[PDB]
Structure formats: structure tokens, C-alpha cells
């Protein structure tokens, strides 16, 4: 509904936490990390708890860009995943690439 | 005596009219 993924990305399995999105994501900005995984494996959320992600392309909306870049360094330092892309999602639906900026 | 008269006023007069207004909202508002 309000948090719609881009096509090609699937939601990782998560039970939902209270560390996630607040009103700012509705009204000012939110962020989205999207990465590729070769299996269904278990990672730690940057907002608390533990999630698992399926094989393929996974996407997750977070409140801050530091939360996405912390999830990116966790994927690098724990499961060697280096194709994470970070978008800044505006409330009207506009997505712009802010990591990696050089491509 | 051993009476709470304010409780008689609540549960026999105020609360049934309360309850009929709540059931009116339940049976007349669509969805």
C-alpha cells in the first residue's frame, strides 16, 4: 500500500518490529535498500530483531540512510553481498540512487 | 443503609440509555 516495492523485488520474511518506520517516512522521506542473495538465510535487522531473506532480489524500507548502510556493511562483513543499492524514496513516489553514486 | 445510590443511577438509568445509543450506532451505521 504505502510501502510498495519496485517490481522484481520480493519482501524478506520478518515478523515486524517497533524499531521501524515513523511518520517521517509518510511525510518527509524514507529509504530503501535492495540487494541480491543466493539462498534463504538469516540476518539481523538494524532496527532490532532477526529476519530471513529468500533467494533472489530483496528490498527493505528503512527510516534512515545510516540504517541501510549499516545493513549493507553487515551483508558485506557477514555474507559477502556487495550489490546493495540504496534509494531515497520521497512521499510522492520518486526514487533516486544515492548509493553507489559512481555505479 | 448499605446502599450505593450513585451506582443505581449509573447502571439502571445512565448505562441503559448509553447502551441503547451504542446499539443504535451498531444497527444504523453502514460499515
Amino acid at each position: 500500500q504505502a510501502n510498495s516495492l519496485p517490481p522484481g523485488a520480493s519482501s524478506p520474511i520478518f515478523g515486524g518490529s517497533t524499531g521501524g518506520l515513523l511518520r517521517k517516512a509518510l511525510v518527509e522521506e524514507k529509504y530503501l535498500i535492495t540487494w541480491g542473495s543466493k539462498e534463504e538465510q538469516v540476518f539481523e535487522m538494524p532496527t532490532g530483531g532477526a529476519a530471513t531473506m529468500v533467494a533472489g532480489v530483496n528490498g527493505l524500507y528503512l527510516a534512515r540512510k545510516e540504517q541501510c548502510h549499516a545493513l549493507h556493511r553487515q551483508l558485506v562483513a557477514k555474507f559477502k553481498i556487495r550489490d546493495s543499492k540504496i534509494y531515497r524514496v520521497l512521499p510522492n513516489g520518486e526514487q533516486t540512487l544515492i548509493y553507489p553514486k559512481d555505479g | 443503609m448499605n446502599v450505593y445510590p450513585w451506582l443505581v443511577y449509573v447502571t439502571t438509568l445512565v448505562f441503559p440509555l448509553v447502551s441503547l445509543a451504542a446499539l443504535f450506532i451498531l444497527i444504523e451505521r453502514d460499515t
Binding site: 515513523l22 511518520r23 517521517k24 518527509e28 522521506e29 527510516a63 534512515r64 540512510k65 545510516e66 540504517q67 548502510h69 549499516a70 544515492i98 548509493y99 553507489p100 553514486k101 559512481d102 | -
Partner: protein, 80 residues
């Protein structure tokens, strides 16, 4: 936003882009060192001011200086 300055005493050690939580910095080509690259900050609007780049600069005095300035939502680290 905060003000990130790169001076001319840089050695291209690749430690201020690795230890930065927000990707403010990137390496551009340069001639005045042995790595052939100097740091730069085109994304200062996302910097929080956390100074982990200033912790990890191996010179005498740090070639990167971040100056604490005007505070935004992104620079105050707010998830709300």
C-alpha cells in the same frame, strides 16, 4: 549541513571511505600522492558529523576536517 574539507596532505590510504557510516566521501584521481587519489565530499547533506573518518586518518594532523554547522533531519540522525 556539516562542512567537510579535504586538504593537500592526503596519502590515499583508503580508510576514510571505509570507516564512514553514510558514504559522504569518494576517491577522485589526483597527482600529488602515491595512490593517485584524493578524497572528496559531494554528499555533505547526508553527513551526521560522527567523525569516524577523523578517527581513522593516519597523518599527523587529519587531512579531513568536518566542521559542525547547521543541523537538519539527516545531520541530527533522526529516524522520526
Amino acid at each position: 549541513s556539516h562542512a567537510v574539507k579535504i586538504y593537500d596532505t592526503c596519502i590515499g590510504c583508503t580508510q576514510c571511505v571505509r570507516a564512514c557510516p553514510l558514504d559522504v566521501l569518494e576517491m577522485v584521481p589526483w597527482d600529488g600522492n602515491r595512490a593517485g587519489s584524493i578524497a572528496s565530499s559531494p554528499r555533505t547533506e547526508d553527513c551526521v558529523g560522527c567523525k569516524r573518518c577523523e578517527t581513522a586518518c593516519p597523518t599527523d594532523f587529519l587531512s579531513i576536517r568536518v566542521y559542525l554547522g547547521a543541523e537538519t533531519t539527516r545531520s541530527m540522525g533522526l529516524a522520526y
